[PDB]
């Protein structure tokens, strides 16, 4: 169903705590002010333990943060003092903030649960050996692991049957800024005319882990 | 048995370019997020405005608010300024390339701040504004930016590309190049 | 025993999980490789509510953490899954740790709850004026409050006996490294010879409010 | 209104240069460091003694096994380094100075990283190396360190003094001045 | 008479191996012993696990101090090496022999080090790479150390069997022969 | 119950007492490093008296030690000085070593007192003569005695009803490295058709001596 | 009257526990055959604490041993067996080994009291550069002592009265067989025009430190 | 600097040289020992003398002792022998050397067995009987032992000496040098 998403509600600040400033680079720089404020809902096991974290940045530091763990707002700077106990004596805001883990998060996550959480993308692998540098070191083979979602991923390495362990390097999890990541898991060994190697991918878009031979 | 999430609600507003964003993510990804000048919900994918909806006018009354706290921010601060933050570049194609298969080419701008950057894709050395797409300024872990801008593109031993991203914080253009290597 | 501090016990990291590195490219800028670890224990009235949060970093990015909320190992980046996936699966450690909110966290709270907790320095508060015979623009009544602890402090102005609410500009809370705090609460305003200024400093450390009075 | 507190222990190897430092910190302030040289417990205020003990080998040991992970860290990221971050400085005096009423001068380090730095007090110009004291390198919240150096003064209209640091991230030595103005 | 016994905790760290290991003895017998690579406390003999326990990352700690400490010792001797040490080789059967019942051989590798060898059995000239086991560096009286390697093996006239054991105290490697005999 | 063995604790090494160094046995053998450290407590009677001995090598050298009949740390030899003089320097780390003795030695004894101490298995006594060639021609009788534990062991040999006390050669008590042990006990003798021949076992885990009996 | 130094007694070994050896070891080797006993008198504080260990060898093994804080006996090889049963069931050989801690070890220890523990002998400290060649301007400083005893001797090295403690490498202490010992202190350090450096040596026969100056 | 010392009596047999030694040690120095076969104490130090004395007959009852249990021993183990282990070998001055001032040459020879040796001076490449003195076979901690030779001379740029010792443990004799330099 086609469920509205709702929205953290956020307040507004009043006067006072005047701070001299700090002094940071500057001069010959433009100068910038933002006021950038991110509501986090933290997870665990659905909807089970729910945690919000909310928190305010003014140009490069955060100065103050909402907890839902602690109940209150609270000054990470001076800076943000002011705020803290203005909205920490607002009985009204305060009990709005603190319903907001249910009234936002786990509402949101409930919507999100029917298309996000069980969104899943079969990843595309490939195999194949690279640096044709017999003088630089040693030989690589290369397991391509493209175009999946989500990002937890298991790549193995085996030769001739028995998985490898050693000699492994991998390029990470890469994100691509479009809800598919990427990655390349490499195995630093001496291909020989006489020898089988396979690339063992688990991944929760498979029923069953996908492998990939290689021989040269 | 392990079902951890993060869900982020992530909005500013920014002087004195009077620019201001609204958006929500899952994990890292983007959900969608508002434009303050059209007040328009943009799905990140297109498929999800099907499962939900959101009402642009709350992301807006939102900047709003964030608008008037930033004045009280700049007087509660004597409008001190802070360094530029220059961004760290990198260009990398979207999935392994294959000579003559359409592919699509990343341009990835991280940790910076603040959130305004041009951008640039040169193909052969000339701008190119066709096939190419980018996502809003979206949230780190920290107090920085990232974000993505997108070029389709077809793989081919004679051409090479370049990102160019300016910054604030950068004394000069950065340029990051990128051509196919079998 | 409790008279003795009790140390978080750090465990050791494996193979695996290789990375090809990337960073960020400095060329001319020295090389150097830190192992960066913080325990920190969370109080919330005492020892009634704890989280333990321990923080891992390389260099400059934290990689992997540790929520005695959550109660097993989080990766925060690439670099620190392989400690993860490898302190995880041990459950003697994990069971060690997870206590650590009370063999460690609790337990120096009330060795320091008999010290540090209760320490408190009365603060020492002057008024004066500044800029003058070398400045065009508006004077300004300082009031200085140094040498107090804990920090948090409550200073107000005052003129004819009628509190000021604005023109108040502060250096803000500084820390001075010794265990002392020293701030600068300024009221800008233009002395006239037939007026009397007050600040109010409020402070735990004090039984009632400080004053100090000052006429041009 | 509640008792909130947080103690923190921070500790570290740092390579090349292979220092190592443990600490304790309450509510942003250092209860004691272990000296790896010296295997020797440290109160920054010689008056906590009296209250607790530490074990030093315990704190030494803990050391060892950072600078057994650091081995393992620079393999799993093939010796990858970091950018230098510059430190932010700031010279203040530590309480109200009055003319002949001897004082202090501090000297904040804060905001840099790897935790190693070179100060040098200066009074008129000329190095000074009686009356001067420093702590360890202190936890802030995040990634970087924050350190504090001190210089016993005689307030005169006379003399100037300059707090003069050094640090890998900076292209040449930093230093901020400072002098008396009644 | 008199209930008179030895127990022992034995570890150590190698260079340039990068080997270490930690172990426990009762008498002349291993405990236990922790695999520095898989964190895990290996008890001897399976059933002693019921009867107590170990965490193994508390022996971990204590290799990263031997590890510390290896290097401290290098610096103080000036990275002068002394002269490897080669092992006796002895090959029996662990119990009676009796044609068509089961057994096994024993090979004893004794007064060696540094505590690095490479062990390869060998039945009718070929190489056995099932039904071997072997205990970790064992402690002797001095500073030299003992191992146990195991061959499982059914009793017949027409087998012989080959213990190799190569040492860099060994020229070439060091073979032992073993065959029935009525 | 919840019975965990304990580990003695390391110090760790300081710097200064370096040496200059000289031939060893380098030059075409491979360089070698190893800091080796074993700590043994002595029982004399279960817990009645207990010794703790401490012993440091480096390579192939013994060069510090920690006697608990002694109280504190000493150079064996001088690369071991720098040690003894730093460590003894530490009262706090010194009455921590002179503990262990308890803390350490005590403790696990009792652990190991439950199993260890008390275990005890059977003997298998097995009778046979070796070398016969042909026709047969054996001078030697081979009692075998194997899988048995403690170590302890008492063998006698007896021919018709009246002991032997020379003649007899054994290959000692051998250690199988899995708790058990194994030894043969040989007597040379020419055995003729007309001779009764037997092995006497005595050993702590029989309650009365095991006999085997022998005859050509 | 002139004390007389007693020797420790030895005992006959006897019959049985004879063993079949090992084998074959070298065989080009000549073939030799050692009885080598050693009884050590351990003093602490004195003859406060006297502590006896006789050490019994063949050849290249200890294989028995008398400690008298165990009273008896005990095999370190199974070569030593033989002796252990033997001489432990004799009880007035246990008691006369028991009796020479006194008869023995302090009795002779009295004895050497008058002038082997109070031998003193004052070094002979010298200073002076080193590494000359061709090029080369500056290099260590050797701080020489010799001709001293007893051995417990501690080397400072200064520099412009400050006290250096990195860049000292010595010979450590040197046994000459004669009751006498010497050493080599050096300093790592580049000697200026303008510079004074100084050897200080404390020695149990020197009333007061002796120190030696250097300068370019 | 607790009185800590330590006081043994070392005496040995051996075969087929059929020799034999007994000796006093006081922290690792000799006090004295006995010719086995002149039946007389010799005292490492003549003034010793004064302060102690021993009847050199009970050294030859100890030795008698050790002469028949070796038979014993050999019996024992089926005489079965051991590797002879060849010694280090050192050659250093007494003291601090000044051309034209009486000196010594300390030959030391260390960790060897069995104790049996032939030493030979040379000076400029000639044997040296002049002026040459040795120690007995000296204990040391393990199963090995130790000894010294000595040679007095007259410091001169231009000779030089080598110590040439032979043990049935060395393929060939082992030769260290030593001439003048300061
Ligand atoms: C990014 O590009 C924008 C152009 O859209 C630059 O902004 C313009 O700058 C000029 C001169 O500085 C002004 O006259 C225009 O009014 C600006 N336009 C807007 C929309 O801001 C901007 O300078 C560029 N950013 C950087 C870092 O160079
Ligand atoms: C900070 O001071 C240290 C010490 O003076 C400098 O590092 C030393 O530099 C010299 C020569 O460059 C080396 O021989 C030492 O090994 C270095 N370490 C030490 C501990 O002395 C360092 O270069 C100075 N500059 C900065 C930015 O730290
Ligand atoms: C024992 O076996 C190991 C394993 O093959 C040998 O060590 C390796 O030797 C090769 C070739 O010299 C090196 O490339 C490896 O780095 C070594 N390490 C490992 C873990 O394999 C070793 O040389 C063999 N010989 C002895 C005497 O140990
Ligand atoms: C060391 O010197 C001894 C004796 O000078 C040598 O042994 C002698 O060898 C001859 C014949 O080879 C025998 O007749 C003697 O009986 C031996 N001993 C003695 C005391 O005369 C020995 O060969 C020399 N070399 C070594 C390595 O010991
Ligand atoms: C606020 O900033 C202005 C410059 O924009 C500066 O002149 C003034 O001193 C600052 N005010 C205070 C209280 O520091
Ligand atoms: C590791 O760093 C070296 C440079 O020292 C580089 O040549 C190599 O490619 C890096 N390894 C990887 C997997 O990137
Ligand atoms: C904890 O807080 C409650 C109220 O929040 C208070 O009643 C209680 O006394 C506190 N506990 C302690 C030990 O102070
Ligand atoms: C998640 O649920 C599991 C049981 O399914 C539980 O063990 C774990 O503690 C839960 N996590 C949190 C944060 O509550
Ligand atoms: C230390 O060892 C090195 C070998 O790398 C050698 O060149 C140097 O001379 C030695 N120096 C000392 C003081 O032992
Ligand atoms: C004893 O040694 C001899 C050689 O000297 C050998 O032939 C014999 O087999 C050995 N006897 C025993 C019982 O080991
Ligand atoms: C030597 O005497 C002191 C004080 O009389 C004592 O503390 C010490 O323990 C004694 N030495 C020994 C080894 O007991
Ligand atoms: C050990 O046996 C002795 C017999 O001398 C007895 O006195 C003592 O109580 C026993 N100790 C223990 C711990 O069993």
New binding site residues.
């Given amino acids: 169903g086609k469920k509205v998403i709702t929205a953290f509600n956020e307040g507004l600040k009043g006067g006072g705590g005047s701070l001299?400033?700090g002094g940071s680079g500057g001069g010959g720089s433009r100068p910038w002010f933002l006021e950038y404020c991110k509501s986090e809902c933290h997870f665990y096991n659905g909807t089970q333990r729910v945690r919000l974290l909310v928190r305010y940045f003014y140009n490069l530091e955060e100065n103050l943060r909402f907890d839902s763990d602690v109940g209150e707002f609270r000054a990470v700077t001076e800076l943000g003092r002011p705020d803290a106990e203005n909205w920490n004596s607002q009985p009204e805001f305060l009990e709005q903030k603190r319903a907001e883990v249910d009234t936002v998060c786990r509402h949101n996550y409930e919507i999100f649960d029917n298309f996000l959480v069980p969104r899943r993308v079969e990843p595309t692998v490939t195999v194949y050996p690279t640096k044709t540098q017999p003088l630089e070191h040693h030989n690589l083979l290369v397991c391509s692991v493209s175009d999946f979602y989500p990002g937890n991923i298991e790549v193995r390495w085996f030769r001739n049957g028995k998985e490898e362990k050693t000699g492994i390097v991998s390029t990470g999890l890469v994100r691509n800024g479009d809800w598919t990541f990427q990655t390349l898991v490499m195995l630093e060994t001496v291909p020989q005319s006489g020898e089988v190697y396979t690339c063992q991918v688990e991944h929760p878009s498979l029923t069953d882990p996908v492998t990939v031979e290689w021989k040269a | 048995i392990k079902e951890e999430h993060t869900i982020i609600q992530a909005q500013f507003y920014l002087l004195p370019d009077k620019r201001g964003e609204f958006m929500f993510d899952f994990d890292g990804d983007e959900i969608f997020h508002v434009d303050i000048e059209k007040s328009e919900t943009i799905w990140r994918l297109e498929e999800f405005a099907k499962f939900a909806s959101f009402e642009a006018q709350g992301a807006l009354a939102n900047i709003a608010v964030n608008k008037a706290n930033l004045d009280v921010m700049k007087e509660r601060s004597?409008?001190?300024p802070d360094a530029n933050v220059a961004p760290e570049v990198t260009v990398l194609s979207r999935s392994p390339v294959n000579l003559g298969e359409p592919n699509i080419l990343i341009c990835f701008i991280d940790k910076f701040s603040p959130p305004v950057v041009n951008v640039t894709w040169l193909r052969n050395g000339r701008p190119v504004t066709e096939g190419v797409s980018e996502t809003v300024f979206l949230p780190r872990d920290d107090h920085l930016f990232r974000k993505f801008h997108y070029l389709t593109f077809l793989p081919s031993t004679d051409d090479f590309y370049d990102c160019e991203v300016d910054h604030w914080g950068l004394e000069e253009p950065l340029r990051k190049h990128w051509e196919f290597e079998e």
Avoid: A, F, L, Y
């Fill in positions: 001299v400033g | 004597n409008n001190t």
